[PDB]
Design a protein around this nucleic acid. Structure first.
Length: 290
DNA sequence: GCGACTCAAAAAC
DNA sequence: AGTTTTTGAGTCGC
C-alpha cells in the first residue's frame, strides 16, 4: 500500500495511490521527492567579461510534493498542489567572486543583467505548453497567479526536510532562521566592495532569491488529462535557466523588465522530468469511490 | 467536466 | 493546551 524510499537527507518518500489510500491533507506523507530531472540541452554560452572564462552552469531541481511513483509511472493529481524547487550552480566560480564579476553572452556580446529561472509544463508527446497556476496559502480566498520568472544567485539546493519545514512559516523568529537559506539581501552587503558594473548590482531588486521555490502549483483546471483513445496523456515539467539582457537568432522569451522596457530572457540550460501522468477529477481516481 | 462551497485533519503557533 | 491555518477532497449543479 505504501512504498518507501530513503531520501538523500534521511527523510523518506512514501509513495501511495490515492485511488486506494486516503491520507490527511497535512500528513507528512504528502511530502515526497518526485521525478528526477534530466538535461534537455545547453543553449547560450556565458563568459566572464575580462578573463573570457566560460561559466559552467548546472540547474539543480527537485519536486518535493504532488507526485508519486506508482507501478513505474510518476503520477500527480489535477486538484492537488505540487512543489518544485530549483537552484543553479557555477562549478568554476565561487559565489562571492561571481557577484563581483560581470558576464556576457557569447552569441556579439550581450551583457547579462541577472540570472533567472522559469518553469513550464508541456505535453511530452508533442511539446505543446500547458498552463500552470499557483495559489497563496489562502487558496480560493486569495489570488491565483501564473508562475513567474525568478531572479536567482547560485546556491546549493536545500534538503527535502528544509523545504518541508519552511513550507508554512509565519512566525518571525522562525522566518529569521531560514532567511539566509532562501534570500540574499543586497542592501546588507558592503557597497564599497562592489563596482558599479558588478552582477550583484544589476539584479532588479535588493531581495534576491537563492532558491526558486514554486509551491502550491497546479496544472490549469481546463487541462485534458486523457487522449481521445482514453490512454493517459504524458506531461513533463521543465526548468529553464536564463540570462536577462537588455534588448538594445537564439532561444529566448520576452520579459517585462524593471525599468518598464522590453527585456530578453535568453535560454542557457533546460532540464525536464520524465513523462508524468495526471489524474483528473473523476470519482474513480479516489479511494472514496471504493 | 469544472467553479464553487464545504468538511475535516494535522501542522503551526 | 488551546485556536487558527492549510490543503486533500466530497459534493452540488450547471
Amino acid at each position: 500500500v505504501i512504498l518507501t524510499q530513503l531520501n538523500e537527507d534521511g527523510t523518506t518518500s512514501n509513495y501511495f495511490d490515492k485511488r486506494k489510500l486516503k491520507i490527511a491533507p497535512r500528513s507528512t506523507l504528502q511530502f515526497k521527492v518526485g521525478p528526477p530531472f534530466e538535461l534537455v540541452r545547453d543553449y547560450c554560452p556565458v563568459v566572464e567579461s575580462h578573463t573570457g572564462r566560460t561559466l559552467d552552469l548546472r540547474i539543480i531541481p527537485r519536486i518535493d510534493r504532488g507526485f508519486d511513483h506508482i507501478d513505474e509511472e510518476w503520477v500527480g493529481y489535477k486538484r492537488n498542489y505540487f512543489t518544485l524547487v530549483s537552484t543553479f550552480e557555477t562549478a568554476n566560480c565561487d559565489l562571492d567572486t561571481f557577484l563581483k564579476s560581470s558576464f556576457d553572452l557569447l552569441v556579439g556580446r550581450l551583457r547579462v543583467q541577472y540570472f533567472a529561472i522559469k518553469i513550464k509544463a508541456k505535453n511530452d508527446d508533442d511539446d505543446t505548453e500547458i498552463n500552470l497556476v499557483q495559489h497563496t496559502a489562502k487558496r480560493d480566498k486569495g489570488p491565483q497567479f501564473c508562475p513567474s520568472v525568478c531572479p536567482l544567485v547560485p546556491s546549493p539546493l536545500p534538503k527535502h526536510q528544509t523545504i518541508r519545514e519552511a513550507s508554512n512559516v509565519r512566525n518571525i523568529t522562525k522566518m529569521k532562521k531560514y532567511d539566509s537559506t532562501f534570500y540574499l539581501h543586497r542592501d546588507h552587503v558592503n557597497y564599497e566592495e562592489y563596482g558599479v558594473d558588478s552582477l550583484l548590482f544589476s539584479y532588479p531588486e535588493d531581495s534576491i532569491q537563492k532558491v526558486a521555490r514554486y509551491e502550491r502549483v497546479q496544472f490549469a483546471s481546463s487541462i485534458s488529462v486523457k487522449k481521445p483513445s482514453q490512454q493517459n496523456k504524458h506531461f513533463s515539467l521543465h526548468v529553464i535557466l536564463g540570462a536577462v539582457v537588455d534588448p538594445d537568432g537564439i532561444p529566448y522569451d520576452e520579459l517585462a523588465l524593471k525599468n518598464g522596457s522590453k527585456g530578453m530572457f535568453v535560454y542557457l540550460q533546460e532540464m525536464k522530468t520524465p513523462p508524468l501522468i495526471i489524474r483528473g477529477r473523476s470519482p474513480s481516481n479516489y479511494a472514496s469511490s471504493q
